[PDB]
Symmetry: D3
Subunit: 157 residues, 6 copies
Amino acid sequence: MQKIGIYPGTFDPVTNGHIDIIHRSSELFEKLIVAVAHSSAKNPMFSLDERLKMIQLATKSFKNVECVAFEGLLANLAKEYHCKVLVRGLRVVSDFEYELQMGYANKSLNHELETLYFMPTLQNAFISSSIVRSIIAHKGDASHLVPKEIYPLISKA
Amino acid sequence: MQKIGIYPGTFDPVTNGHIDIIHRSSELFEKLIVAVAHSSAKNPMFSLDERLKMIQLATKSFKNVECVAFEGLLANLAKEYHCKVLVRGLRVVSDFEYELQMGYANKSLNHELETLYFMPTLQNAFISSSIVRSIIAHKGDASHLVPKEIYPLISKA
Amino acid sequence: MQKIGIYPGTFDPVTNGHIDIIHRSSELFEKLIVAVAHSSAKNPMFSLDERLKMIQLATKSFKNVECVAFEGLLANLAKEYHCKVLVRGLRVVSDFEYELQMGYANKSLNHELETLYFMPTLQNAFISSSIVRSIIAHKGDASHLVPKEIYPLISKA
Amino acid sequence: MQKIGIYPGTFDPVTNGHIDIIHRSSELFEKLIVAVAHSSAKNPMFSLDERLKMIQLATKSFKNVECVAFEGLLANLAKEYHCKVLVRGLRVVSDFEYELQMGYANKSLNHELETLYFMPTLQNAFISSSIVRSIIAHKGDASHLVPKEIYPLISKA
Amino acid sequence: MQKIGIYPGTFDPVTNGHIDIIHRSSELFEKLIVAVAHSSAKNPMFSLDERLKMIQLATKSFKNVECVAFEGLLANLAKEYHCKVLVRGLRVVSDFEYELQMGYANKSLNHELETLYFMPTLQNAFISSSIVRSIIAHKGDASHLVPKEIYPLISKA
Amino acid sequence: MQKIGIYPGTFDPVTNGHIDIIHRSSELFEKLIVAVAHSSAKNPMFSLDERLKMIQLATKSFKNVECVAFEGLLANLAKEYHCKVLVRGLRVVSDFEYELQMGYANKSLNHELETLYFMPTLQNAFISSSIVRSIIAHKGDASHLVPKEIYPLISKA
Ligand SMILES: CC(C)(COP(=O)(O)O)[C@@H](O)C(=O)NCCC(=O)NCCS
Ligand SMILES: CC(C)(COP(=O)(O)O)[C@@H](O)C(=O)NCCC(=O)NCCS
Ligand SMILES: CC(C)(COP(=O)(O)O)[C@@H](O)C(=O)NCCC(=O)NCCS
């Protein structure tokens, strides 16, 4: 169970909230895979290449964290890594019942596959990607909400 | 972080939902402490001594699980165990925002103390101790909702 | 299924919201049983006998409606009436997830027993017995919130 | 009231959850109309023709259930059938207040028109069309979630 | 603080609910600016020109209310008016946590900028723009839900 | 409307969240009445006299703020002050729908009486008196959650 975890996400963009979750989850698992979704259904603000580079840059200081691009079925991705744990983040604005529904769907597709929920720190408890995209989209200062080493990337495009 | 986890609760009484959380959370920590709080102010149906003895019997098969009854603040109890991770369960009828608040209250009181959330099995996602207490008080069949090694007792007193 | 419906409740006291549900649900079943639960553990403001007598008077105009007071599990009461359908009301302040849970708890206890939900009228969508008890305890005007054929009583004791 | 009910939906696709609701509702009403919406505002995964054929196939075993295509105002559709009852389904992931708002909107447009809520069985309480579309879209196995007689249709396109 | 308030919105279209909020808020502030957003992200049913004319017509009877078109960052707009108060409306169907998140985001961008929540009247508590657009889109009667002096405009296009 | 505001509460005890609401709401009204309700039926931890004396000391710096203890219906108390605006606070764990209901209940009882909602500061958005009472009862450090001018007292009795 504790050998490997997968943290799936659009990471559009990576926020301080996401970094808290990568931090706490990487401490518990011998290896954390951060799986960067295509999300085409959602038309993301940042391209996969941008979103992979932001999260790879934001996570250089974690040695057991690997970033992969992924466009498939999470249940299948976990099986190919022999992964028994999906990492998810919970925040004030979470659709909690939707999160539970997703945990039971993923476990129906892969009977080994459990879901574990982490919280960001209190200062980040009201951060959501959607806020950050709104503040970016409206040419506001998002620099307090995202790791400083990726702000140069987001602020542009 | 992986050395010790604390699963705190009133456990009035321990249900099958609680057992799924102990099962799953115990696989992630070298040692799991099940911490049964007096919870005087609540007016628990079962004495603190009955509740400890019920969970003690229901967990006897889990070799790295230890049960303790405590009178104080949970945040101080974790500091005494050098415990950095609280374990909580998430269910359909959880008060999700109150769990978040209690997570941050526990952090503000012990700055090393994160909260992590597991889910019970889908069959048990609809169990609450509060349902279980109604059925017990109206002298109904709760056999299907609690571990059988305790039902000798709740069914009686 | 259409032979008999049971509308269970504490009815402490019966409100205009409850009357809309009895009105609408009684049109769908050949016979509707209004089942007033003791609900000891709750600490109802009105005695079980006062609550039965209030709903009895408030429903006397509905010819296929019958009121009964019961001490036991609702699921067993429905089995005694060969009743397959529980009637419940949905309001703005309903605990929607708890209603769902209680529906499935009632099913797990009596495998023939579905729960169906009606709505009160829009004017009454904002009434709860809990509001009504606050107004009564602070000796205020609840006349607008309950059927007048009971207000002789609640207003007094 | 009990003569006819209408069960409106996109049915994109029909799930085991929808079949539970058609089952329980068809038992209460002398006739159930299943009204298959265009939903163009939502760009449905399956075409009206597919969605009409799936639900007509999934409901052959109910003799008092008719399927019609419909692109209009539910309030007007109910009036043309002299229908006094809209059937809706409630699940763990429901927007409960939105469901109430829709019941009062439909009753404002047609003062005869009441809304009644059914639950699916517990095994189906976490099924939603949106889950099923996600699992389909991601080339996952949705066969446990939809009636077997329509899986051949969905799995393709 | 009490000198000026800003009431931002898409107003797609202006509802009786919005007029209640403009009414109560204009009584508290020496001046209310109603800021009509582009909302392009949302593809609004009515054009900015329509939405500015509806709200300017619906508010002629309030002498301290000004309507402006606005496409920017609310935090910056408030600073240019030296405004310390964002007016927002709360209804049964509100995403309450999202409203709180937006209040803290706007205050992070402008440390002077507080958010104040008004309620519409009870008769309007279930009105939402989204309902009104649905009833319009479905060629239903929305005349009970929007000020009569703007119905001629909406009903057309 | 701007002449007088009433901020009603149990204030058991007054917290830093409450102080932010008094601070912000007092800037908007010529005079703010902090109305401490007996709330017998609740079983407040602090006597009505202790609660008045705590808020009295915590507000002594606010020159237009006056504290009063009352036994009756709030709606009648506002009528006695010729008060048209109730002030309430909104927090992460607020029961948002119950606040709305109580707003409309207060209106139906006093037809001139609107309710307005403020937010505390982000640091205090996660405080509830209920958290504070748990910490006090388990004899823990609540110093960080209440105004220090009261902590002489709560910490003791
Ligand atoms: C008992 C519990 C873990 C909650 O458990 P429950 O939800 O099973 O009742 C919580 O109330 C607790 O920690 N109680 C011990 C005393 C304490 O620390 N209270 C302050 C909480 S911030
Ligand atoms: C009284 C009620 C119908 C709920 O009614 P209420 O919401 O009006 O209090 C429910 O508590 C009930 O069924 N009580 C009787 C005993 C019972 O069956 N309890 C177990 C519920 S699964
Ligand atoms: C005390 C309160 C303001 C709510 O405050 P709280 O949420 O801090 O307990 C409310 O219960 C109240 O107004 N109580 C006084 C009596 C009353 O008017 N009750 C009827 C409410 S419609």
